A paper describes a structure:
Here, we report the 3.9 Å resolution structure of the [name]–[name]–[name] regulatory complex. By replacing the ligand-responsive ECD with a homodimeric leucine zipper, we mimic the ligand-activated geometry of the ECD, while reducing complexity of the imaged complex and increasing stability. In our structures, we see that [name] is displacing the N-lobe of the pseudokinase domain of [name], binding to the C-lobe at the N–C interface, and guiding the unfolded N-lobe into the [name] dimer. The [name]–[name] interface is relatively modest in size, with a calculated mean surface area of 689 Å2 (as calculated by PISA Krissinel and Henrick, 2007). This interface is partly driven to form via charge complementarity, with positive contributions from a cluster of arginine residues on [name] (R30, R32, R39) at the periphery of the interaction interface interacting with D609 and the polar residues Y580 and T586. Here, [name] residues 528–544 (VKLDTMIFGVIEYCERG) lie across the upper region of the [name] CTDs, which form the floor of the channel. To our knowledge, this is the first structure of a membrane protein client of [name] and the first structure of a non-kinase client of the [name]–[name] regulatory system.
Largely, cGMP is produced in response to the activation of guanylyl cyclases (GC), a class of receptors that contains both heteromeric soluble receptors (α1, α2, β1, and β2 in humans) and five homomeric membrane receptors (GC-A, GC-B, [name], GC-E, and GC-F in humans). In addition, the PK domains of mGCs are regulated through phosphorylation and via association with heat shock proteins (Hsp). The chaperone [name] is known to assist in the [name] regulation of around 60% of active kinases, both in soluble and membrane receptor form.
Author numbering:
A (entry chain D): 527 to 612, 616 to 732
B (entry chain B): 12 to 218, 276 to 613, 617 to 690
C (entry chain C): 2 to 58, 89 to 134, 142 to 160, 178 to 199, 206 to 243, 249 to 266
D (entry chain A): 11 to 220, 278 to 690
């Protein structure tokens, strides 16, 4: 006379955040005040780093569309790098000048896109925000001059108040050079991120 | 520098073979019958070229005889036999088989197939015995006797007395602690479990003498179609599934190539009672090679959501193990799944071309179909096509989603729906006034598992979907309507805020909606979040829990009733009247109860209604 | 004797790659597309290698033809070095399907024949009917061994009542009662109630 | 006449069988050699125990592994005892002749060593992944010797190669063409992380230049006497054994000597995992060790299902295990261990039962698992009953056990009471308890579905029964004055009961009057057998099964009316005045509808109720 319980189907984690960009807008979904810290940023960058490191090992090591609105965060505090987006002339600040010059999305575009998304996620501001101008067409036009004689990068000149991630700032400076040759591999990034996460985890 | 040959001690290998090679006890019978079987088809092949080979006997039978008073077991078969040369080296050598030599000398084409490629089968019989004796007669050699007792020395001799025609008689002495293998139930169970698909009859003797047969069913999938008929399929299904009802769907499958196999798949009529109750280890699909039972208990063989289909798969060659229970390099076992599921799914299409039989099929297997369309992350698109659902403007029947899309109105880019608890609830609910006023269609949702599927089914042939119980529905209007209600917001502005202080929290934003023509108010849920059914279903799961996903709430108000304009006039009169307070809280209570959401404390509502009715009563 | 052809196969995707950072729905399509484009590029490579020697065909030309011949040798070498897919191990041989569409006297027969044969004999619930139960009760009322026959009567009569409650044929509705009995106080109460009914 | 010969064996097919069709994976080959070095190390130590003069040929006893990818070679260098010409031409060159067993048997009567391996057919597993094997050996007497083989059918023995060596044995492996995946750095620690962690000799690993990671740091402690252990060492061993960052909660040391000797360490966790009931991976939280080697894990017939959080290890020796080194034949022996393990787990729980806030945390963590264990097992109810705690009404916030409630009963009543609801506020103010509250009795609460699951199977406690406050048949011991009061009440209200039956009926079996309401007009009660309202609500939603015939025979209700309120008096006086009016119909349907709403069931349609109240308010507002 007992139903004999059993057959728990669990549950999928409820889908919610869909762009990793709309999270950076509303305090209702996630407060923008004192809730802002550094352990969240190092954690999310760490998950992106390990995901990219695993992805780049296999035969599908080339992604081609490194884009934050592609990245998704669920409600288990986990991050996924999906396809989502599913010839494309779709110009954006997020593409590397190596595409705008001739062709052939490759490693260097992935490194450049990683740099710009890291910038956008640390500073918490608009896409490629510059205090000098706020119109999109001249943003694209200046990008068209990125192969000129002076670089034009996201605003991370100076002032720290934090020290700490001085290494990570060295990486983000490394990602912003016209020459695509010297750009580092994933190894230094993931090692430094793992060491910082461990320093923040043993406490 | 010197070169030396390889050595191998014999004595310790003898105990190595009989102690740590197998794990159970019910396999020596299978080994012995397999040996008798290969002898049988050996002499059978020898017959077609020489009839005189069968002068010493025209019948091919295998029999087993127990005897309790001597505690002895006897196996009798008529086959090829041995000569003196065979007995000395073929049997007395560890890890050597005459089958391979015979088939290599027979390198003139393949017409028959036999088993045995290792050469340690015989000594397994020594697991539960002390003395083994073999009596052998050959077509051109005299009667010979062989005896052994696992000591390192074996005995051969010329025996006299009790002449036989030809063949082999094997007599096994038994232990004292293995008496249990001398009864009818155990031998019947073992023989029906392990070796019940051999192309020769097997009998058994119990002592008035008795005559009976342990297996009298023939293999079926070895004959080509265009000869088999429906009645044979029905009889085979009845024999295999030990039931009384017939089958519903049959399919035959055959492949080729380096990996070759044959398959039969069956779909039944009525649903089994203990289907998802599990507990019992799955025993649906069996695997065989050359008609001996190898593996069962499907683990990666077939997906979990198709655990209702019986069938049989036969192979020809496979990398087996020293002990024949497992399969080396299990990855190959995966591949067959890709060749099975697909093909099986094909059947589901062919059944759809006739009307009523598909209703009969759906009525019991809807739940399996829903679990499949949920879990199958790759073939979701194919599975989503063959669903059948209720709808508003039909009768009592169900239609297909494509038929639904075939009648879009003119400027309609979305498909609406609604989930609930029963038909009569969503039939006259408070959300379905304007969508029927303008003239459109709705799809009703009624099962607890159904609400999972819609959670994953977001798109269908270029059109998205929205839920009628979410904030921000968009449907077409015309310019007079738009000017009319935007000037309507310019009237309740003060009203738009007053509820805010009365109900403080547990309300976020209040606006004037356009979905109500016969009800004043309703409660709407946010976009990112759940519905009420989601909350109650989660509260139904008892083995789980966290939290923190509860969606926000919104409240709606209608501009047509006289009640709301009376509230407006009383509110603009003053802000210090308790009449507006109590009627607003009562309206909120009834509105929140009217939309499926659970209550908080029924005592307040009961007391309020009691006071109302008592005051109306006259006291 | 030897097994070496079964050591290198590739799966499109099954379960064995689940690093909790990548989405399975995207990884699956990525792997499948990678395999198909690899197939196509090797395909064009064989066409190029073929066309080389084919258009090649004096001593220099013979040397070129020999060099492309060794190139084809290398191509077969790499082909033998390529792993097995899921799309080269089998072909179809034949298929078919069947829909399986279906196309007082009975009471008297099922009474007399079944009652006589089962009285001689005494699978039951599979074959016996209400008249058989009536004659079993008749045998019990002739009797009043006792406890066991009474127990079987209550057991299969309860099976018939369960079938009536479920409005289904008891011919295939007998395993559920046993799997539920493997309530006891109620069963004993009904047992003693039926015992005092039949004895009275 | 008769003859008696001896058996003979073939060599080529035997070798092919022993290489190609015996094992289920290819990672074993490292494990075999790693194990087969330590035994020789032990022989060195034991032989040196008596002869000090063997201290002048070497003081280091280790094992080193060197890979090389320019030349595609693997080297395993050990400092073992080695062999001479006779053993090299005798022991290694033949099948199934183990020197370990001979050495063990030759010396006895008070020895202490358990060398790994008795079959003698293990070393050839080196041919699983490679193509040529070579062994360099110099034991203690003559020059070095080399042995080269390729599993062809003839091996080669060679004299000194001119390499100056002190002692030990080197095994050099020539890797195949495609197995270079066994050369990069990751898989080395991945493989050695699982099998051969607990071995009593240090292990190093060389990779490059500008010594490295030693893949062993933790000496196992279960081999020691559990009488001078301390908390800190036990804690750091806990931290080493599993990946976490918190200290332990409680531990238990277990040892049985007799027909079967076996020891065990068991831990309870601290934070409950978030996937304790997730599918797949089964019950796996326990590892099986024999002779300091891992065999297998995640076998269901080891621990009862309701225990999926205890973490530890059980180790023993002298067990019958098969060739593949992945299971244990004669499964009968495996069944005996659980009957002791579960008893020791219950003992640990009972000992923990003496602590206050540790038990608070433990209960808050695993209430559901404890209650599932209560429901499932049919043997340990008497013991698992004492570990349950509940809410009450006389203590409030703080918890209580059934023993305290038994200890402070009132001296007249012979029953225990309970009530199952949705949350605390649902039943803290409901209409089902007023008279009990007035008298001064104690009613226990229940607020989780697993409590609902476990309450059915429970039958009594210390000889007292459990009765519901939501079922017909509830009485309190009172004086017969109240009895004749209800008597003349029945004699005074029968026609009202008939009217309440004949109003619309089809929903109520009978209408009765009892003493459980003092401040409410009407209420709903269930029957002596069948499901409750909460039962229907919980079982109507979860899972996939759908057949409500059972509920069709576990669902029936009765209505109760309190004949004290003025409203009942008014409706009754209008009733006996006349019963053909419509106002009586309106009032009775309203009362029944609000009673159904307050009972706990679900209304078949709230729209009609909403329309009724809306009409009432419309008339009240005078529109
Ligand atoms: N009853 C029998 N009749 C004829 N030949 C037999 C019989 N029993 C054994 N043999 C002979 O014994 C040899 C096979 O012995 P063994 O059973 O050890 O090997 P196997 O055939 O590879 O085993 P299995 O088929 O059980 O895997 C063959 O030469 C076969 O002819
Ligand atoms: N490097 C070595 N140094 C010394 N003795 C060795 C060495 N390798 C093997 N032996 C010895 O040679 C014999 C061959 O052992 P083999 O590997 O065949 O089987 P085993 O020792 O029974 O099993 P296992 O390898 O599982 O321990 C044993 O007596 C073993 O102790």
């Amino acid at each position: 006379t007992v139903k004999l319980d059993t057959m728990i189907f669990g549950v999928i984690e409820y889908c919610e955040r869909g762009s990793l960009r709309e999270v950076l807008n509303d305090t209702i979904s996630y407060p923008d005040g004192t809730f802002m810290d550094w352990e969240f940023k190092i954690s999310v960058l760490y998950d992106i780093a390990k995901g990219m490191s695993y992805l780049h090992s296999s035969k599908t090591e080339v992604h081609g569309r490194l884009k934050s609105t592609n990245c998704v965060v669920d409600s288990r505090m986990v991050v996924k790098i999906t396809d989502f987006g599913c010839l494309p002339p779709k110009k954006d600040l997020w593409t590397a000048p190596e595409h705008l010059r001739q062709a052939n999305i490759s490693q260097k575009g992935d490194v450049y896109s990683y740099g710009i998304i890291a910038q956008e996620i640390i500073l918490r501001k608009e896409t490629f925000y510059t205090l000098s101008c706020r119109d999109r067409n001249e943003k694209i036009f200046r990008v068209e001059n990125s192969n000129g004689m002076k670089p034009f990068r996201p605003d991370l000149f100076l002032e720290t108040a934090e020290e700490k991630e001085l290494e990570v700032y060295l990486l983000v400076k490394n990602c912003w050079e016209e020459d695509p040759e010297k750009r580092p591999d994933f190894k230094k990034i993931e090692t430094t991120l793992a060491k910082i996460f461990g320093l923040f985890h043993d406490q | 520098v010197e070169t030396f040959a390889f050595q191998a001690e014999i004595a310790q290998l003898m105990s190595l073979i009989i102690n740590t090679f197998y794990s159970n006890k019910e396999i020596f019978l299978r080994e012995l019958i397999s040996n008798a079987s290969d002898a049988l088809d050996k002499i059978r092949y020898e017959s077609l070229t020489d009839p005189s080979k069968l002068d010493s006997g025209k019948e091919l039978k295998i029999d087993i005889i127990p005897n309790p008073q001597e505690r002895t077991l006897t196996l009798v078969d008529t086959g090829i036999g041995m000569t003196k040369a065979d007995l000395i080296n073929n049997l007395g050598t560890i890890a050597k088989s005459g089958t391979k030599a015979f088939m290599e000398a027979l390198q003139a084409g393949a017409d028959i197939s036999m088993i045995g490629q290792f050469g340690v089968g015989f000594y397994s019989a020594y697991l539960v015995a002390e003395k083994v004796v073999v009596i052998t007669k050959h077509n051109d050699d005299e009667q010979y006797a062989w005896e052994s007792s696992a000591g390192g020395s074996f005995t051969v001799r010329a025996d006299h007395g009790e002449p036989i025609g030809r063949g082999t008689k094997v007599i096994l002495h038994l232990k004292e602690d293995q008496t249990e293998y001398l009864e009818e139930r155990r031998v019947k169970e073992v023989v029906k479990k392990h070796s019940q698909f051999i192309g020769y009859p097997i009998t058994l003797y119990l002592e008035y003498i008795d005559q009976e047969e342990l297996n009298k069913t023939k293999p079926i999938w070895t004959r080509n179609p265009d000869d088999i008929t429906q009645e044979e399929y029905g009889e085979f299904y009845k024999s295999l599934t030990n039931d009384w009802e017939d089958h519903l769907a049959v399919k035959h499958f055959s492949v080729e190539g380096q990996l070759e196999f044959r398959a039969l798949l069956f779909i039944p009529r009525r649903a089994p009672f203990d289907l998802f109750e599990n507990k019992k280890k799955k025993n649906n699909i069996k695997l065989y090679v050359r008609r001996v039972f190898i593996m069962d208990s499907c683990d990666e063989l077939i997906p979990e959501y198709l655990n209702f289909i019986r069938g049989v798969v036969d192979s020809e060659d496979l990398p087996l193990n020293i002990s024949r229970e497992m399969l080396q390099q299990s990855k190959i076992l995966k591949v067959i799944r890709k060749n099975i599921v697909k093909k099986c799914l094909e059947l589901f299409s062919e059944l759809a071309e006739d009307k009523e039989n598909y209703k009969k099929f759906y009525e019991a297997f809807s739940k399996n179909l829903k679990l499949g369309i949920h879990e199958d992350s790759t073939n979701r698109r194919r599975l989503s096509e063959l669903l059948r659902y209720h709808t508003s403007q039909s009768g009592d029947e169900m239609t297909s989603l494509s038929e639904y899309v075939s009648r879009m109105k003119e400027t309609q880019k979305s498909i609406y729906y609604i989930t609930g608890e029963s038909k009569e609830q969503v039939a006259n609910s408070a959300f379905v006034e304007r969508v029927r006023k303008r003239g459109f269609e709705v799809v009703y949702m009624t099962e607890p598992i159904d609400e999972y599927c819609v959670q994953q089914l977001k798109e269908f042939d270029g059109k998205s979907l929205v839920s009628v119980t979410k904030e921000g529905l968009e449907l077409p209007e015309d310019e007079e309507e738009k000017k009319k209600m935007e000037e309507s917001k310019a009237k309740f502005e003060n009203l738009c805020k007053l509820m805010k202080e009365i109900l403080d929290k547990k309300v976020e934003k209040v606006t004037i909606s356009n979905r109500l023509v016969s009800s004043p108010c309703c409660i709407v849920t946010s976009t990112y979040g759940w519905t009420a059914n989601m909350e109650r279903i989660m509260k139904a799961q008892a083995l789980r829990d966290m939290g923190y996903m509860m969606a926000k709430k919104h409240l709606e108000i209608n501009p047509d009733h006289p009640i709301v304009e009376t509230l407006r006039q009383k509110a603009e009169a003053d802000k210090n009247d308790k009449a507006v307070k109590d009627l607003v809280v009562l309206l909120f209570e009834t509105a929140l109860l009217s939309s499926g959401f659970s209550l908080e404390d029924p005592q307040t509502h009961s007391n309020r209604i009691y006071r109302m009715i008592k005051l109306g009563l006259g006291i | 004797v030897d097994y070496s052809v079964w050591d290198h196969i590739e799966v499109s995707d099954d379960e064995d790659e689940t690093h909790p950072n990548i989405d399975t729905a995207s990884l699956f399509r990525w792997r499948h597309q990678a395999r198909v484009e690899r197939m196509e590029q090797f395909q064009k490579e064989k066409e190029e290698l073929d066309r080389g020697c084919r258009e090649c065909k004096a001593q220099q030309l013979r040397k070129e033809e020999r060099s492309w011949e060794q190139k084809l040798e290398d191509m077969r070498k790499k082909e033998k070095s390529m792993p097995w897919n899921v799309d080269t191990l089998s072909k179809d041989g034949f298929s078919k399907s069947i829909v399986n569409i279906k196309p007082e006297e009975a009471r008297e027969q099922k009474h007399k024949t079944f009652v006589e044969k089962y009285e001689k004999q005494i699978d039951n619930v599979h074959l016996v009917c209400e008249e058989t139960a009536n004659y079993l009760v008749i045998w019990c009322i002739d009797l009043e061994l006792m406890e066991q026959v009474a127990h079987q009567t209550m057991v299969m009569q309860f099976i018939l009542e369960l079938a009536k409650s479920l409005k289904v044929d008891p011919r295939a509705c007998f395993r559920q009662f046993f799997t539920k009995i493997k309530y006891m106080e109620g069963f004993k109460y009904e047992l003693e109630a039926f015992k005092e009914r039949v004895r009275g």
